[PDB]
Design a protein around this nucleic acid. Structure first.
Lengths: 122, 328, 114, 112, 110, 111
RNA sequence: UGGCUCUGCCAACGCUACGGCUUGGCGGGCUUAGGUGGUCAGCCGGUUCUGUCCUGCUUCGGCGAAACGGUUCGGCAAAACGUCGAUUACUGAAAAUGGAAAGGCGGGGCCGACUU
RNA sequence: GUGCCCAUCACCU
RNA sequence: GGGGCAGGCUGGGA
C-alpha cells in the first residue's frame, strides 16, 4: 500500500508533532475549561498551544534552523502559558498537577526539540 | 461459533476492525518512523490498505532482518507498519478463532493468559495434585523450525475462508520451515503450532497437569518415569509430526524447581531466573555507569512488580549494597 | 504553472470538503476552528506563493501547510468536547489532501530535477 | 504607481466588500477571513509602495492571487454561493486591473 | 523620536477610537481591522523608535498610509455609514500631523 | 536574563486582571492589550534564545507598547478606565522589567 | 468558548450622513483507548567461595534423592465453550467463502463451601 | 521486531 | 568426598 508519502519526511518533525499532540491532547481540554472571562487568554493560549504544531511542522519542512528555534521559542511560550494559567489566571485554569502533568509532556517535546536542534546544528 | 469460519476477510478488512488493527499496530510504536510516516495519512492509508486486502492485492513488505542477540542470537525480522497493521488485522479475527481452541493450559500470546498466569498455573498445579516430579521441555529453534506447511494444516483447519487463507499465505507463505520470529501472525501460528503438542499432552497421553508457554512445556506428574514416557511420546510426535527438535528437556523431581518463564517455580516458593536478575542488575549498573539514576526509579518500580511475585530480596539488598539507594 | 493551477484546483476539493466541516465546528472549539480555517483556506496562499516563485523551500512550506492541515484533521477528530470532524470526515479529507500532497510531491521533484 | 495601485484596489474593495457583507451569518468566519484578505490586501500594496524592494511586491501579488481564490471560494466552495459568477467576472476584471499595475510595478522594479 | 510621534498619534487614536467604535457591527471586520490598524500603529511607531532600521519607519509609514486607507474606506463603506467625511477630514488632519513627523523622521534618518 | 520573564510575570499578574476586565465595549483594545501583555513573554523568550539586540529592542518596544496601553486604557473613560493608580502601579512593574531589559541590552551591546 | 455582520425594548460614554450607529442593560432567537517502562517466548558458560540440604534403591542397567495469591476448597461437568467428529454427513452438477449432528475427549466451564 | 502478562504515567466514567 | 538447591563472583554473547 506504501503509506502516502508527504514530501520532506522529517522524523524529528513527525516525532515532535506526535509527541506534541499529546501536549495538545492534554492542554486543549483544560484550555477549553478556562471560563467565559479569560477567553482572550484562552484564545491566545489556544493559538500558542494549537499553533505550536505549525511551528514544528514548518520547522520540519525547512532546511532552516531558524524555524527550529522558533519552535523552541513557542514551546518556551507554551511553558509560560502553563505558569500563566496556573499562577496568574483567577479561578485556576490549570491546577498545579495539570501544570505538573503538562510540564512533563512539554518537557518530552522539549527533549525531542533540543535533540532536533542539536542534530541540525551539527 | 460452530466450526467453519468461511468469511473472515470480510471482517479482517472491515473499517471498524482495521481501525482496531491500526490502534493495535500503533500501540507503543508511536515514536517510530513506521507509525509517524503512516500516521500522517492514517485513515487514507487504512483505506488503501483495506482496498489492498479486500481486493486481494496486499503484498507483505519485505522483512528487514536484523539479528537481535540479547538473550541469544535470534534472527528477528521486523515488518513495516503497513505490514504489522495487516498482521494485526488478521490476528484480530484469526487469532481468537485459534486461541479459542488452544487448551486452557497454553499461556502464551493469548488474552488474560500470560507469563504470570503460566507461572501461577505451574505452581498452582504443583500445589494441587501435589506433583512429585515434572517434565520441562523446550523446542530447539521453535519459530525457525515451525514447518510452515504442517502449520498450514492447522491454520487451514480453522480458517476455511479462501481469502483469509490467502492473506495468511501472504503474511506467512505455506512453504518451508521458518516462521519469522518478530511477527504477531507468528506468535499466534507458533502458539497454534505448539498447540499441537498441547493436544498431544492433553487429548492424547491424557496429561492434565501441564503448561505450555509457546515452546516451553511443563508437565507435572508423579512418576519421573511416566513423565519421561510422556516426553518421549511428546518428542517423537513433535519431531515426526511438527519437525520441532527438542533443545533442552528434563524430567526432574519437583525440588529442582520448574524453570518456567523467568520464575524458578517450586510448589511452595517461586524465585526468579538468575538470568533476569543478572540482566536487570547489569542493566541498572550500565544505566548507572552511563548516567541515568531517575529513569532507574521508573524501571525499579516496574521490575519491583515483576519481582513482587517472586520471593526476591536477592537483588534489592544487592543493589542497596552496591549503591546505597533506597529501592523498597 | 501547470502544477500550481493543478495543485490549487485539487486543493479546492479539500476546501470544498473541509470548509463545511470547518464551518460546523462549534464555537466552543472556536479558536481551533478559526485556526483550522486559516490553515485550510490559508494553504492556497502557500501554493500560490510556491507557484509565484521557483524556490523549492516555498513548495516545502506548502507541504508543511498540508501536514498542518493533516494535523487539524487529527486534532479535530480528537476533540471530544462538543465535537468536530467525525472519523469518516478525517478519512475522506486525508484522501483529498493526499492527492494535493501527490501533486505537490511531483511538483517538488520537478523543481529538484531542475 | 504606489497610490495608483491602491486607488484601483479600492474599486475591488468597493465592489467585493458589499459582496463580503452579503455572506450570511453562517459563513461569518469565512467572511471575516475573506474581508481580512480583501481589506488587508491594501496594506500589502501600501507596504510595497513604501519599501520598494520586490519582496513585498510579490507578497502583494500573492495576496491578489489569494483574493482571486476567494472569488472562486465564495462562488464555488461556499456552498450557498455568496458570490455570483458575474460578480466573479467583474471583480476578476477589477483585480485584473490592479494586477496589471502590479505586473508593471514588478517589471519596473526588476527591470534594473 | 518615538515619543513625539506616539504622543501625536495618541491624538489620532483619541479621535478615531470613539469613531472606530461607532463603526456598526455590520461593518465589524472592517471595524475590528480599523481598530487594530488604529491601535497597533502605536506599535509600528514604538518599534521604529525603540529600534532603528528605516524599514520600521517605512512600516510605520505604511501603517499610517493604511490608517488613511481605512478613513477613505470607512467613509462611504456602505449603507451602514462608519465614518463621516468630516470625521475622515478631521482624522486625516491628525494623521497628516503624525505623517509630517514621520516624514521628517524618515528624512532625518536618511 | 530570564529574571526578566519572572519579573514580567508580575506585570502580567498585575496587568492581566485589569485586562480580563476591559469590557466587550473596548474588546479590540483588550484583545490587543492582552496580546501585547501576554505576548511580551514571547518577545523576551525569543530574546533570551536569540541573544540578539534586535530581539531585545523588540522586547523593549513591546514594553514601550505596554506603556502605551497603560496610557490608552487610562483615557478610555467610563467605569472601565484603568484607574490612574493602576497606570502608576503598573508602570512601576513595567519599569522593573524595563530596568532589567536596559541592563540586558547594555550587556549585549557592551559585549 | 468574554459569541451573533441579531432582533424587540429602553437607556446614555459617545458618534452621527439626523436615518441611525455604537454601547449598556433588558427580553427573545442563533449559537475507554493512550503514553512510558518492564516481563517473557529468549542464552551459553566457568569457578570455587559459600549458605543449606541430599547422598538411597538396586534390576546392577540406571533411577534416583536435595505463608499465601481466590495459584482457594470441595460438588458438577447436563448445558455452553473447546476440540476431534468435519471444512464430514446432509442439500446441491459442484461445496460452491452452505452446512450439521449422534457421539468421544476435555476443563476453559458450571455448582456450591469458604474467602476474596 | 512480536505479542501476552505486569508496573507506572495520563485520563474521565 | 560426590550431588541437589540457593546466594554470590566472573568470562563470553550482549
Amino acid at each position: 500500500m506504501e503509506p502516502i508519502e508527504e514530501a520532506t519526511k522529517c522524523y524529528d518533525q513527525m516525532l515532535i508533532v506526535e509527541r506534541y499532540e499529546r501536549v495538545i491532547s492534554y492542554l486543549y481540554p483544560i484550555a477549553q475549561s478556562i471560563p467565559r472571562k479569560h477567553g482572550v487568554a484562552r484564545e491566545m493560549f489556544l493559538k500558542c498551544l494549537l499553533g505550536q504544531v505549525e511551528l514544528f511542522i514548518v520547522a520540519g519542512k525547512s532546511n532552516q534552523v531558524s524555524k527550529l528555534y522558533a519552535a523552541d521559542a513557542g514551546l518556551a511560550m507554551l511553558r509560560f502559558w502553563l505558569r500563566f494559567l496556573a499562577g496568574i489566571q483567577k479561578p485556576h485554569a490549570m491546577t498545579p498537577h495539570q501544570v505538573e502533568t503538562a510540564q512533563v509532556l512539554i518537557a518530552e517535546v522539549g527533549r525531542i526539540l533540543g535533540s532536533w536542534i542539536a542534530r541540525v546544528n551539527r | 461459533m460452530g466450526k467453519r469460519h468461511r468469511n473472515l476477510i470480510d471482517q479482517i478488512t472491515t473499517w471498524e476492525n482495521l481501525l482496531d488493527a491500526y490502534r493495535k499496530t500503533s500501540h507503543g510504536k508511536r515514536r517510530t518512523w513506521g507509525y509517524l510516516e503512516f500516521k500522517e495519512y492514517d485513515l487514507a492509508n487504512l483505506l488503501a490498505l483495506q482496498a489492498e486486502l479486500k481486493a486481494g492485492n496486499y503484498e507483505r513488505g519485505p522483512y528487514r532482518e536484523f539479528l537481535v542477540y540479547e538473550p541469544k542470537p535470534r534472527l528477528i525480522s521486523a515488518l513495516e507498519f503497513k505490514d504489522r497493521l495487516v498482521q494485526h488485522a488478521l490476528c484480530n479475527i484469526v487469532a481468537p478463532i485459534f486461541e479459542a481452541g488452544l487448551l486452557p493450559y497454553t499461556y502464551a500470546c493469548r488474552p488474560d493468559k500470560g507469563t504470570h498466569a503460566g507461572v501461577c498455573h505451574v505452581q498452582a498445579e504443583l500445589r494441587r495434585t501435589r506433583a512429585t516430579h515434572f517434565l520441562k521441555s523446550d523446542f530447539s529453534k521453535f519459530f525457525p523450525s515451525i514447518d510452515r506447511a504442517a502449520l498450514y494444516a492447522m491454520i487451514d483447519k480453522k480458517i476455511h475462508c479462501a481469502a483469509t487463507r490467502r492473506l495468511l499465505r501472504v503474511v506467512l507463505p505455506d512453504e518451508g520451515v521458518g516462521i519469522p520470529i518478530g511477527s504477531l501472525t507468528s506468535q499466534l501460528f507458533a502458539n497454534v503450532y505448539g498447540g499441537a503438542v498441547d493436544r498431544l499432552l492433553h487429548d492424547e497421553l491424557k496429561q492434565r497437569h501441564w503448561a505450555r508457554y509457546m515452546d516451553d512445556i511443563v508437565v507435572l506428574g508423579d512418576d519421573p518415569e511416566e513423565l519421561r514416557a510422556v516426553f518421549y511420546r511428546l518428542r517423537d510426535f513433535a519431531s515426526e509430526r511438527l519437525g520441532l527438535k527438542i533443545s533442552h528437556w528434563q524430567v526432574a523431581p519437583v525440588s529442582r524447581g520448574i524453570n518456567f518463564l523467568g520464575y524458578r517455580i517450586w510448589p511452595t516458593h517461586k524465585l526468579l531466573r538468575k538470568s533476569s536478575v543478572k540482566r536487570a542488575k547489569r542493566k541498572v549498573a550500565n544505566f548507572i555507569k552511563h548516567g541515568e539514576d531517575e529513569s532507574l526509579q521508573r524501571f525499579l518500580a516496574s521490575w519491583s512488580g515483576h519481582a513482587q511475585w517472586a520471593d526476591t530480596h536477592n537483588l534489592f539488598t544487592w543493589m542497596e549494597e552496591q549503591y546505597g539507594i533506597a529501592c523498597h
